[PDB]
Amino acid sequence: SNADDLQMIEMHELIQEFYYYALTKTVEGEQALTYLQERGFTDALIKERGIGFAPDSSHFCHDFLQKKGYDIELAYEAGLLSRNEENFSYYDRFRNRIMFPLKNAQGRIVGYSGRTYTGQEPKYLNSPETPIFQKRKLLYNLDKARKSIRKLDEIVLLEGFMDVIKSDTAGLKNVVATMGTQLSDEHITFIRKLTSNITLMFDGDFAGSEATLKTGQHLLQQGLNVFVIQLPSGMDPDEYIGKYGNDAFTTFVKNDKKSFAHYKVSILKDEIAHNDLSYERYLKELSHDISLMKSSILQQKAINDVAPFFNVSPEQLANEI
Ligand SMILES: Nc1ccn([C@@H]2O[C@H](COP(=O)(O)OP(=O)(O)OP(=O)(O)O)[C@@H](O)[C@H]2O)c(=O)n1
Numbered sequence: 001s002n003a004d005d006l007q008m009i010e011m012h013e014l015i016q017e018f019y020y021y022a023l024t025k026t027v028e029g030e031q032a033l034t035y036l037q038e039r040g041f042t043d044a045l046i047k048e049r050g051i052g053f054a055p056d057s058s059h060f061c062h063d064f065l066q067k068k069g070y071d072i073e074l075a076y077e078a079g080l081l082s083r084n085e086e087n088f089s090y091y092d093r094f095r096n097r098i099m100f101p102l103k104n105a106q107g108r109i110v111g112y113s114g115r116t117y118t119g120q121e122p123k124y125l126n127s128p129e130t131p132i133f134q135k136r137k138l139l140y141n142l143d144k145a146r147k148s149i150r151k152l153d154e155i156v157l158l159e160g161f162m163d164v165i166k167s168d169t170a171g172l173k174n175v176v177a178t179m180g181t182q183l184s185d186e187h188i189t190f191i192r193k194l195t196s197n198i199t200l201m202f203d204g205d206f207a208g209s210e211a212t213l214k215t216g217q218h219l220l221q222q223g224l225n226v227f228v229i230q231l232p233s234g235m236d237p238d239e240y241i242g243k244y245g246n247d248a249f250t251t252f253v254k255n256d257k258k259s260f261a262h263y264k265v266s267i268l269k270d271e272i273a274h275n276d277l278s279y280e281r282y283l284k285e286l287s288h289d290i291s292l293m294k295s296s297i298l299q300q301k302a303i304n305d306v307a308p309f310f311n312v313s314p315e316q317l318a319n320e321i
């Protein structure tokens with residue numbers, strides 16, 4: 001019910017204050033605090049993002065919510081507690097992790113992502129699916145980014161919410177990320193209401209390239225104008241910012257912004273040039289990809305950019321489309 005949803009949100013927003021105190025003030029939170037500061041998190045940024053620490057006692061969140069008169073079973077359904085099968089008892093889901101509040105589109109905290117700081121697995125532990133937290137709908141930083149997304153008429157999608165935080169601080173405001181999932185149809189519906197321009201800047205590795213192709217193709221099929229920023233090998237935005245600085249980052253992100261079709265064929269370049277079977281199939285694919293582009297201006301430019309990869313003229317490629 002809406003009433004239960006509100007209770008669950010309250011739990012999240014109240015425990016946030018305690019997590020923040022635990023991180024910034026308490027003895028147990030000192031190592032986690034140092035880890036964050038070594039990653040460039042200022043005291044102001046930590047406060048701004050509401051970042052906290054979950055102690056390792058396994059009943060920190062439990063005792064707090066109990067004291068505040070919240071229904072324990074509801075706290076479990078809210079994804080803040082876990083439950084033992086045998087003893088039927090409840091305990092903290094998040095233990096010895098740095099706590100990143102996850103806000104919904106309306107700016108309310110509806111979940112957490114807990115990162116290890118001691119090399120534990122899993123690296124990130126998120127809230128489970130709950131009535132208020134749904135990964136297929138939530139986009140990290142959306143409530144904060146919405147204003148700049150509309151004004152710049154563009155959204156930039158990153159892989160990690162950590163990259164989003166750093167990019168935001170660096171000056172790139174129109175950035176969001178999924179919570180470790182593939183962009184969903186619901187996400188695209190939400191995004192379409194804000195802008196028709198979407199830029200993908202995933203990690204500069206093989207997995208990142210693959211995710212870019214899959215996500216880009218989906219977006220293109222749904223009628224969005226898709227662009228790609230290719231990061232240097234082995235780097236994500238956070239690592240780029242840390243190595244080159246904020247000014248270098250904001251310059252980089254507005255430099256080589258390529259239409260999806262152009263990025264795609266550049267990836268397939270060698271296979272096309274060596275494998276004749278792949279040559280034919282990818283010529284048909286890219287023809288189809290270009291035909292999907294709503295922007296006639298960018299469609300024409302894509303034809304000019306893609307054609308040389310197949311050793312054909314722009315006119316020959318245009319005919320195939
Ligand atoms: N055990 C994990 C690790 C990763 N992810 C998700 O996958 C995204 C991208 O993966 P990764 O590249 O590892 O994120 P980073 O920002 O690089 O994490 P970090 O800088 O803290 O190492 C993360 O934002 C996280 O939400 C996850 O759901 N569960």
Ligand SMILES: [Mn+2]
Pocket residue numbers: 203205207208
């Ligand atoms: Mn990766």
Ligand SMILES: [Mn+2]
Pocket residue numbers: 159160203236
């Ligand atoms: Mn990364």
Ligand SMILES: [Mn+2]
Pocket residue numbers: 160162236238239
């Ligand atoms: Mn990273």
